Design an enzyme around this catalytic site. Structure first.
Site, PDB file in Angstrom:
ATOM      1  N   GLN A  18       0.657  -1.106   0.082  1.00 29.79           N
ATOM      2  CA  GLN A  18       0.228   0.080  -0.211  1.00 29.79           C
ATOM      3  C   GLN A  18       0.507   1.479  -0.059  1.00 29.79           C
ATOM      4  O   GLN A  18       0.663   1.898  -0.396  1.00 29.79           O
ATOM      5  CB  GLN A  18      -1.145  -0.094   1.332  1.00 29.79           C
ATOM      6  CG  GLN A  18      -1.379   1.029   1.630  1.00 29.79           C
ATOM      7  CD  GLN A  18      -3.050   1.092   2.108  1.00 29.79           C
ATOM      8  OE1 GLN A  18      -3.326   0.096   1.901  1.00 29.79           O
ATOM      9  NE2 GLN A  18      -3.784   2.090   2.027  1.00 29.79           N
TER      10      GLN A  18
ATOM     11  N   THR B   5       1.607   3.170  13.045  1.00 26.12           N
ATOM     12  CA  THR B   5       0.462   3.053  12.904  1.00 26.12           C
ATOM     13  C   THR B   5      -0.106   1.623  13.030  1.00 26.12           C
ATOM     14  O   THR B   5      -0.773   0.619  12.660  1.00 26.12           O
ATOM     15  CB  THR B   5       0.169   3.454  11.643  1.00 26.12           C
ATOM     16  OG1 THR B   5       0.220   3.215  10.231  1.00 26.12           O
ATOM     17  CG2 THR B   5       0.451   4.904  11.228  1.00 26.12           C
TER      18      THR B   5
ATOM     19  N   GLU C  32      -4.153  -6.353  -1.930  1.00 28.35           N
ATOM     20  CA  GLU C  32      -4.902  -6.610  -1.618  1.00 28.35           C
ATOM     21  C   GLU C  32      -5.890  -5.354  -3.221  1.00 28.35           C
ATOM     22  O   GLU C  32      -4.863  -4.652  -3.304  1.00 28.35           O
ATOM     23  CB  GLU C  32      -5.584  -5.295  -0.296  1.00 28.35           C
ATOM     24  CG  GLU C  32      -6.543  -4.712  -0.013  1.00 28.35           C
ATOM     25  CD  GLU C  32      -6.476  -4.338   1.615  1.00 28.35           C
ATOM     26  OE1 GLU C  32      -5.568  -3.951   2.079  1.00 28.35           O
ATOM     27  OE2 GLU C  32      -7.938  -3.718   1.880  1.00 28.35           O
TER      28      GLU C  32
ATOM     29  N   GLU D 166      26.302   5.651 -11.063  1.00 24.73           N
ATOM     30  CA  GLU D 166      27.749   6.193 -10.869  1.00 24.73           C
ATOM     31  C   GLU D 166      26.485   6.969  -8.819  1.00 24.73           C
ATOM     32  O   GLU D 166      27.665   7.057  -8.028  1.00 24.73           O
ATOM     33  CB  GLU D 166      27.071   7.746 -11.041  1.00 24.73           C
ATOM     34  CG  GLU D 166      27.850   9.027 -10.583  1.00 24.73           C
ATOM     35  CD  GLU D 166      29.479   8.424 -10.904  1.00 24.73           C
ATOM     36  OE1 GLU D 166      29.511   8.291 -12.114  1.00 24.73           O
ATOM     37  OE2 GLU D 166      29.644   8.393  -9.727  1.00 24.73           O
TER      38      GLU D 166
ATOM     39  N   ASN E 257       8.716   7.714   8.590  1.00 24.77           N
ATOM     40  CA  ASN E 257       7.236   9.064   8.306  1.00 24.77           C
ATOM     41  C   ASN E 257       7.033   9.980   8.889  1.00 24.77           C
ATOM     42  O   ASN E 257       6.057  10.751   8.614  1.00 24.77           O
ATOM     43  CB  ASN E 257       5.757   7.934   8.666  1.00 24.77           C
ATOM     44  CG  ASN E 257       5.393   7.646   6.777  1.00 24.77           C
ATOM     45  OD1 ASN E 257       5.265   8.141   6.552  1.00 24.77           O
ATOM     46  ND2 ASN E 257       5.194   5.944   7.332  1.00 24.77           N
TER      47      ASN E 257
ATOM     48  N   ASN F 245       3.613  11.803   0.275  1.00 23.65           N
ATOM     49  CA  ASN F 245       4.084  10.782  -0.667  1.00 23.65           C
ATOM     50  C   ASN F 245       4.970  11.931  -2.033  1.00 23.65           C
ATOM     51  O   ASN F 245       5.834  11.669  -3.061  1.00 23.65           O
ATOM     52  CB  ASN F 245       3.027   9.967  -1.595  1.00 23.65           C
ATOM     53  CG  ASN F 245       3.145   8.966  -0.067  1.00 23.65           C
ATOM     54  OD1 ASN F 245       3.707   9.000   1.154  1.00 23.65           O
ATOM     55  ND2 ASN F 245       1.383   8.450  -0.644  1.00 23.65           N
TER      56      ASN F 245
ATOM     57  N   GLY G 105       2.787  -6.006   5.746  1.00 22.67           N
ATOM     58  CA  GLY G 105       2.680  -7.717   4.834  1.00 22.67           C
ATOM     59  C   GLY G 105       3.249  -7.759   3.983  1.00 22.67           C
ATOM     60  O   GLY G 105       4.219  -8.233   4.112  1.00 22.67           O
ATOM     61  N   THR G 106       2.707  -6.817   3.330  1.00 19.85           N
ATOM     62  CA  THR G 106       2.734  -6.511   1.594  1.00 19.85           C
ATOM     63  C   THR G 106       3.664  -6.540   1.847  1.00 19.85           C
ATOM     64  O   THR G 106       5.046  -7.418   0.857  1.00 19.85           O
ATOM     65  CB  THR G 106       1.675  -6.580   0.944  1.00 19.85           C
ATOM     66  OG1 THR G 106       0.580  -7.416   1.421  1.00 19.85           O
ATOM     67  CG2 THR G 106       2.248  -6.810  -0.389  1.00 19.85           C
TER      68      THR G 106
HETATM   69  N1  LIG Z   1       5.327   7.698   3.656  1.00 21.69           N
HETATM   70  C1  LIG Z   1       4.430   6.591   3.077  1.00 21.69           C
HETATM   71  N2  LIG Z   1       3.835   5.703   4.446  1.00 21.69           N
HETATM   72  C2  LIG Z   1       2.800   5.278   4.015  1.00 21.69           C
HETATM   73  C3  LIG Z   1       1.686   5.632   3.011  1.00 21.69           C
HETATM   74  N3  LIG Z   1       1.140   4.426   2.831  1.00 21.69           N
HETATM   75  C4  LIG Z   1       1.383   3.765   3.909  1.00 21.69           C
HETATM   76  N4  LIG Z   1       2.588   3.849   4.434  1.00 21.69           N
HETATM   77  C5  LIG Z   1       3.448   3.217   5.445  1.00 21.69           C
HETATM   78  O1  LIG Z   1       2.415   2.108   5.411  1.00 21.69           O
HETATM   79  C6  LIG Z   1       2.452   1.435   6.765  1.00 21.69           C
HETATM   80  C7  LIG Z   1       1.619   0.484   7.134  1.00 21.69           C
HETATM   81  O2  LIG Z   1       1.928  -0.641   6.125  1.00 21.69           O
HETATM   82  P1  LIG Z   1       1.184  -1.304   5.037  1.00 21.69           P
HETATM   83  O3  LIG Z   1       1.968  -0.739   3.916  1.00 21.69           O
HETATM   84  O4  LIG Z   1       0.464   0.068   4.342  1.00 21.69           O
HETATM   85  O5  LIG Z   1       0.671  -2.530   4.743  1.00 21.69           O
HETATM   86  P2  LIG Z   1       1.237  -3.502   3.509  1.00 21.69           P
HETATM   87  O6  LIG Z   1       2.635  -2.987   2.555  1.00 21.69           O
HETATM   88  O7  LIG Z   1      -0.093  -2.766   2.064  1.00 21.69           O
HETATM   89  O8  LIG Z   1       1.011  -4.853   3.413  1.00 21.69           O
HETATM   90  P3  LIG Z   1      -0.207  -5.605   3.842  1.00 21.69           P
HETATM   91  O9  LIG Z   1      -1.358  -4.104   4.169  1.00 21.69           O
HETATM   92  O10 LIG Z   1      -0.530  -6.258   4.592  1.00 21.69           O
HETATM   93  O11 LIG Z   1      -1.042  -5.310   2.901  1.00 21.69           O
HETATM   94  C8  LIG Z   1       2.647   2.437   7.957  1.00 21.69           C
HETATM   95  O12 LIG Z   1       3.086   2.149   8.890  1.00 21.69           O
HETATM   96  C9  LIG Z   1       3.170   3.572   7.210  1.00 21.69           C
HETATM   97  O13 LIG Z   1       3.833   4.411   8.020  1.00 21.69           O
HETATM   98  C10 LIG Z   1       1.944   6.669   1.775  1.00 21.69           C
HETATM   99  O14 LIG Z   1       1.084   6.902   1.692  1.00 21.69           O
HETATM  100  N5  LIG Z   1       3.242   7.308   2.501  1.00 21.69           N
HETATM  101 MG   LIG Z   2      -1.809  -3.713   2.454  1.00 18.10          MG
END
Ligand SMILES: Nc1nc2c(ncn2[C@@H]2O[C@H](COP(=O)(O)OP(=O)(O)OP(=O)(O)O)[C@@H](O)[C@H]2O)c(=O)[nH]1
Ligand SMILES: [Mg+2]
Ligand SMILES: Nc1nc2c(ncn2[C@@H]2O[C@H](COP(=O)(O)OP(=O)(O)OP(=O)(O)O)[C@@H](O)[C@H]2O)c(=O)[nH]1
Ligand SMILES: Nc1nc2c(ncn2[C@@H]2O[C@H](COP(=O)(O)OP(=O)(O)O)[C@@H](O)[C@H]2O)c(=O)[nH]1
Ligand SMILES: [Mg+2]
Lengths: 152, 432, 48, 438, 36, 432
Positions: free
Chosen positions: D11, D179, D71, D254, D206, D228, D144-145
């Protein structure tokens, strides 16, 4: 004596000619070369085209962008209202609204600004009040929820 | 009648050498299409040294264009005077050395030095008699240093009786544009002392001081440095292309400047350099060109000429000018401060007069300085290398291409032998 | 020069100043300034 | 042709790539339709867009990107957003069920099926490109992903595409604000996966971006869309030299040849120097020394660690726009004399400068204002040892009572390789200490 | 060519917009880039 | 380039600051938006800056007078970073401005000092504008002056402090703030200039026939005094008086650095035509006690050093004649150890008129800054006010609770009594 006659085309001597070759230069040509036109917000429309779903989406996206820009401080809406009144009255006119949007630097057409002013002008007084301004630019107001509500 | 073959290498040597072909083509009258439009018959006198012949009066340079990245030959060809080069000479790689001496010398160079040498052997066999090979490149880079010195080693074996001019830039002591510059500098010099016949040392932060304080240029761009370099490389050859009272070829400057085979590093200068607003304020005369010649702030090398004695020196005066005034001035500069000149060489300074001045000025001069003070620049590079190599920092990017750590050992053992050899002849008296 | 002129005149000056006790200086300056303020209060302008 | 492939995992990866490719469409003039309008009289601008967009047919440009997620609720927002026509319909890869903060599902149970379809789309995009420079992987360590499928994907890219550089822009767990609860578990397991597989790693925190948005863009209620957007400025300025010609071109090869001393130390920092808001800017041009000083300030740095504790092992400066090579040397020289920043004793000259000729672009409605100069600094330092030991303490107090382990051992993952990831992180902490020690 | 020429011309116009004597510099400053 | 950085502290500092930069911008033609009124002109106006930013800092702990500048007619001239505000004002307390709440902002203020010092090429001095009756002017003024002596040496500090009137005041703790601030101006300020509000009222009421003057009318002509004294740096003239010329000729001794002020042609618009204003009679009116900005009689004391600064078309012939007519008057008394008692500076620029301002257009003006022993007359009245209020120890729990101790009251009082003794000793004469 100059046995090598003429100034010639191309660069010459350091301290005598500029770095730029005389074949390509001697004129301020590319000081403002941008290579691309300024890109608008993808939801906005330059012309009005009222009564259409694209116009509804443009109004909703513009008001959502305005709300997200003006709800960043705790009192940014009041501060922006103060910075936009200009003529020291508590009310906001058409030119002051235009100048405020230009200060906010969202690339919005004049007719679209006038349309937003007309929707903000609830009482049809030709002049926005603080109540009308905050009612249009609440943090999750109905004009912001119109972005979600596209099927109407 | 004797020709010079130019090789430019890497990102550094391409943009430096492009400005050299900016100035020589204008100074000989070649317009950007490739034809001739100058109104002087001395421009057409000796075109063969830097230009070939073609149908319809077109003149193309004797340049072999070299880099491991195709980005710079997009930039070289796009500008003015970029259409005069033959596209067969645009030999380019795809990957890129990327500031790694191992990638340029061993892996990506050996795959490209075969096709490069075919272009160089084409240009050498074409002309009548080679005066020498001129190369402009970098030492802190990856393509001008890694594969630039690979060509020097290859072309010295094929043509061993010919000259070799290397206008190579060196890292600055104050600010370094690349972190691995001392690795690439020390590996280049060890491959360059044995092969290159004579060398001209350029430094960007000596040129920045030149641009800010002599040209009154507040914000000097990247190409203004090359135009100061391009005038020297055009000024190094003024006796070949034009008549004069005393003629000094590349071999003439070789025999008068290097007393020993290993002391072939020079600091080079450029005399008639005043600002645009001071063209009427500065009164040009032979004492004025002489005085700004020997000024230490005029040198295009970061080393300070007052720290070490001048071993030998050379002056290449241009313009209709009196041979007695230079001959009196060269005695004057040797006798005013004899502590800056080595005792066991009488007549340290050689003078050559060309009676045809450059474009726009009636008098000019170029200074070559063989000074022992250049060991200060080599010692600062040496101190960087020993500090890094003791802890094997940044070394896995060099041993990945087959260069073992034993190769780095003799890269220093000839590096510190240079500053040992340069120190002894400075300390040398007439007796011992 | 120091001992004959400067030390002597500075000794006389510092002796007279140390003889002057500060409360007398504040009393005298207060009286003079109050006189000036009274004149510029009750009088239309003061002229040199 | 110099051209890269950007993969965005999870995500966080796909939400950055929604803002990352938004700026890529605006620099090259590509509309959200995917069509480039004709401008002036030019034969073609092929070298400009080929690094990110492939010319398809007549006037259609598609990105060289893979958006893969287990997802569908985050990948269908792209499919119904403003850029629904830009992307290839099978470059966006969806799944049935998400990994749900589980490293075991993303690596073993459910990530194994979807990774086979990933390499099929990678092989087709690698076939389309003539000369590939490197894979830019974007993922979340704390998800997780991102941690799970990212570990499986980078292992497959290492075996298939040998020795090609992998630049890792990974969202990393924060010290204070985070989070999710099992983030220290997911952070320690993927560290062993990205220690030896990716070549250059850029740590993104973050809370560090929250601090930057509060004091530079003067917004104390930011959104991940705002976060982002200035992440996108970092990646765009990093590969700005491939797109546009400049005085000192710095490529991806480089980067790894100058910014890592040793193979096991590659965890870097990030900072973007001129960050001024839309209203606060008025007419403000900033000096090159001012933006260089602002880049090296600890408050303007994009991962939560103080550079004053650590030693800058290596550092590079990506300059953009109307900046000359002289004042960058004048800017660096006073940094070397500034004693509040420190270099390690075995790297006496530690700067790389990249000057590109294209001034940075601004999205409409974005917080950042139009600036003509920019510095994007990514530096390697021993202050990363503060980061990795910070969640080492978090993981140690959690694994002692073996909480949140029955989820991980249930989904195929074995008990014993929790300690393998911890001992690997323990050796990584020792590696940073002895290298930085004088 | 257009990008490189734009960079060169902007450098030249920075050079010309510096070295300009305003005459009231005792109590006024232009801007930090022109005061570099 | 010669320059002065000004610092405006407190309520009175930036209300004069609005008035002084109103006159500064009109002198040099600078428009209120900051820009002085073919391809370069487009470049110079939008992408670059022809804008001139002031080298001032407007700091006050109370935001109401700061945001008036941010929302006033000069919102674009000043940088938003340049104007410093605060949460709670020092509130008529030297204790709050120097120890408790002035300590938090003085660290932020010096950061903007460092940016203004880096922007300039060569610094000459510091202007300080404050009121010694208020807490922010006294407390934060002393705190900033104490810190400015630490980081910066050889850079002079000029003080223009509005001292309280003997009769009327707008505050009750007014003697306490001025006594404590006085010890800081003796120790840390190189040159301090007394200003008295009641004297400005009498100049406005009598010579400029304004029956009901306000602070806007007062600050318009105080800005005329400030602009005239630094005017020799901005504009050329027959005789120049730099900011280091001003120190070396008006402080015979390091402790005595208190100077008066006077502006000669304070004539209204209606009265200007009938008035003959030559150099002879404006200097006679310059020494007029009704024309002084400090409510004191100069005939009580004797002048030590005096500087007559002139604006407009003044020849050096008649300023010398005005020197001779003043020296022969028996009411104007000089001390015996300064025979050459005058410094004359001529600036060719006539004094500009504020549009809507009360003063008329005159071609001749005198800004008379004189060192006199009549300053001790001012400090004696302010001392007697301090002694009565400190005998009962009133208004002390405000100062003691907010960081200060009881011993600072007696320490600053003891320094002022030394200054009372210092004037009586220096002003002593040697006769026969
Ligand atoms: N900088 C930044 N961090 C993000 C953003 N969206 C999610 N995160 C980070 O993602 C973490 C939550 O895990 P996710 O990346 O949402 O989970 P995932 O990679 O989709 O894995 P699953 O939920 O199991 O499918 C949070 O702690 C955020 O720090 C974003 O738009 N910008
Ligand atoms: Mg996810
Ligand atoms: N000439 C002149 N004097 C002023 C002006 N405004 C205030 N003053 C002087 O300021 C004194 C009052 O103290 P202030 O300067 O207002 O105190 P402050 O700067 O607000 O400091 P704080 O009270 O601690 O916030 C009065 O006695 C006036 O003499 C002005 O506009 N012009
Ligand atoms: N004077 C000058 N120096 C240059 C030029 N181009 C590059 N350099 C210098 O060359 C060094 C980097 O060279 P590099 O690009 O790594 O060479 P490469 O590895 O062979 O491509 C920097 O220190 C620059 O200062 C130029 O046109 N003129
Ligand atoms: Mg106040």
């Amino acid at each position: 004596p100059q046995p090598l006659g003429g100034p010639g085309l191309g660069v010459g001597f350091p301290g005598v000619t500029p770095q730029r070759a005389a074949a390509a230069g001697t004129a301020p040509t590319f000081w403002n070369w941008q290579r691309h036109k300024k890109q608008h917000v993808p939801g906005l429309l330059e012309e009005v085209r009222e009564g259409t779903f694209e116009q509804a989406q443009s109004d909703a996206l513009l008001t959502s962008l305005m709300s997200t820009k003006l709800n960043q401080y705790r009192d940014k809406l009041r501060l922006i209202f103060r910075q936009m009144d200009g003529n020291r009255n508590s009310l906001i006119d058409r030119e002051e609204f235009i100048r405020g949007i230009a200060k906010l630097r969202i690339n919005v057409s004049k007719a679209q600004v006038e349309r937003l002013f007309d929707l903000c002008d609830v009482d049809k007084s030709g002049e926005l009040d603080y109540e009308e301004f905050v009612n249009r630019f609440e943090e999750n107001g109905l004009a912001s929820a119109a972005r979600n509500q596209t099927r109407a | 009648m004797r020709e010079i073959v130019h090789i430019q290498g890497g990102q550094c040597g391409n943009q430096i050498g492009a400005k050299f072909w900016e100035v020589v083509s204008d100074e000989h009258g070649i317009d950007p299409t490739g034809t001739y439009h100058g109104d002087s018959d001395l421009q057409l006198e000796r075109i063969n040294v830097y230009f070939n012949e073609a149908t319809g009066g077109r003149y193309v340079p004797r340049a072999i264009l070299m880099d491991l990245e195709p980005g710079t030959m997009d930039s070289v060809r796009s500008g003015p005077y970029g259409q005069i080069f033959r596209p067969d000479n645009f030999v380019f790689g795809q990957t890129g050395a990327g500031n790694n001496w191992a990638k340029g010398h061993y892996t990506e160079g050996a795959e490209l030095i075969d096709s490069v040498l075919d272009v160089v052997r084409k240009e050498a066999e074409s002309c009548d008699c080679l005066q020498g090979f001129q190369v402009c490149h970098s030492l802190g880079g990856g393509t001008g240093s890694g594969m630039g010195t690979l060509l020097i080693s290859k072309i010295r074996e094929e043509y061993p009786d010919r000259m070799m001019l290397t206008f190579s830039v060196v890292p600055s002591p104050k600010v370094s544009d690349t972190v691995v510059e001392p690795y690439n500098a020390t590996l280049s010099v060890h491959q360059l002392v044995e092969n290159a016949d004579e060398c001209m040392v350029l430094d960007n932060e000596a040129l920045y001081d030149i641009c800010f304080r002599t040209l009154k240029l507040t914000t000097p761009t990247f190409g203004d440095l090359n135009h100061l370099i391009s005038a020297v490389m055009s000024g190094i050859t003024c006796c070949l292309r034009f008549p004069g009272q005393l003629n000094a070829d590349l071999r003439k400057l070789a025999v008068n400047l290097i007393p020993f085979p290993r002391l072939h590093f020079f600091m080079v200068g450029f005399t008639p350099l005043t600002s645009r607003g001071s063209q009427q304020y500065r009164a040009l005369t032979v004492p004025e060109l002489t005085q700004q010649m020997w000024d230490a702030k005029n040198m295009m090398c970061a080393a300070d000429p007052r720290h070490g004695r001048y071993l030998t020196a050379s002056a290449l005066f241009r313009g209709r000018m009196s041979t007695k005034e230079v001959d009196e001035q060269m005695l004057n500069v040797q006798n005013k401060n004899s502590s800056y000149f080595v005792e066991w060489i009488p007549n340290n300074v050689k003078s050559s007069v060309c009676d045809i001045p450059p474009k726009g000025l009636k008098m000019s001069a170029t200074f070559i300085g063989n000074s022992t003070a250049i060991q200060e620049m080599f010692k600062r590079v040496s101190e960087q290398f020993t500090a890094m190599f003791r802890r094997k920092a940044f070394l896995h990017w060099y041993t990945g291409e087959g260069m073992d750590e034993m190769e780095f050992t003799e890269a220093e053992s000839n590096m510190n032998d240079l500053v040992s050899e340069y120190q002894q002849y400075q300390d040398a008296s007439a007796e011992e | 020069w120091s001992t004959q002129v400067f030390d002597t005149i500075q000794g006389r000056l510092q002796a007279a100043v140390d003889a002057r006790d500060p409360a007398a200086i504040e009393s005298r300056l207060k009286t003079q300034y109050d006189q000036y303020l009274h004149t510029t209060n009750t009088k239309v302008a003061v002229f040199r | 042709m110099r051209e890269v492939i950007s993969i965005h995992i999870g995500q966080a990866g796909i939400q950055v790539g929604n803002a990352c490719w938004e700026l890529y469409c605006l620099e090259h003039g590509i509309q959200p339709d995917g069509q480039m309008p004709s401008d002036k009289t030019i034969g073609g601008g092929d070298d400009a867009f080929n690094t990110f967009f492939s010319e398809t047919g007549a006037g259609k440009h598609v990105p060289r990107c893979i958006f893969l997620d287990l997802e569908p609720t985050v990948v269908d927002e792209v499919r119904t957003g403003t850029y629904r026509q830009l992307f290839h319909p099978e470059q966006l890869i969806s799944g049935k069920e998400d990994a749900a903060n589980n490293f075991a599902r993303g690596h073993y149970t459910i990530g194994k099926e979807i990774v086979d379809l990933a390499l099929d789309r990678i092989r087709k995009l690698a076939d389309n490109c003539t000369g590939l420079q490197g894979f830019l992987v974007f993922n979340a360590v704390g998800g997780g992903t991102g941690s799970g499928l990212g570990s499986l994907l980078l292992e497959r890219l290492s075996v298939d595409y040998g020795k090609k550089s992998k630049l890792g822009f990974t969202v990393y767990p924060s010290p204070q604000v985070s989070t999710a609860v099992v983030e220290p578990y997911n952070s320690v397991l993927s560290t062993h996966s990205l220690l030896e597989h990716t070549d250059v790693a850029v740590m993104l925190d973050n809370e560090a971006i929250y601090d930057i948005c509060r004091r530079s863009l003067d917004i104390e209620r930011p959104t991940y869309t705002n976060l982002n957007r200035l992440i996108a400025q970092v990646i765009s300025s990093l590969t700005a030299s491939l797109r546009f010609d400049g005085a000192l071109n710095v490529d991806i090869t480089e980067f790894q040849t100058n910014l890592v001393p040793y193979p096991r130390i590659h965890f870097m920092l990030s900072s973007y120097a001129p960050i001024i808001s839309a209203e606060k800017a008025y007419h403000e041009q900033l000096s090159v020394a001012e933006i260089t000083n602002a880049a090296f300030e600890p408050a303007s740095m994009m991962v939560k660690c103080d550079p004053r504790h650590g030693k800058y092992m290596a550092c590079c400066l990506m300059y953009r726009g109307d900046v000359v090579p002289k004042d960058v040397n004048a800017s660096v020289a006073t940094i070397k004399t500034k004693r509040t920043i420190q270099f390690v004793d075995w790297c006496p000259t530690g700067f790389k400068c990249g000057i590109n000729y294209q001034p940075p672009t601004v999205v409409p409605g974005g917080d950042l204002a139009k600036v003509q100069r920019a510095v994007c600094m990514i530096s390697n330092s021993t202050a990363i040892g503060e980061i990795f030991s910070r969640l080492d303490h978090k993981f140690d107090l959690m694994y002692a009572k073996r909480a949140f382990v029955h989820w991980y051992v249930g989904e195929g993952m074995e008990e014993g390789e929790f300690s393998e990831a911890r001992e690997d992180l323990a050796a990584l902490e020792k590696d940073f200490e002895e290298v930085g020690a004088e | 060519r257009a990008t490189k020429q734009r960079y060169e011309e902007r450098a030249e116009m920075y050079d010309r917009t510096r070295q300009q004597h305003e005459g009231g510099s005792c109590i006024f400053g232009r801007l930090p880039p022109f005061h570099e």
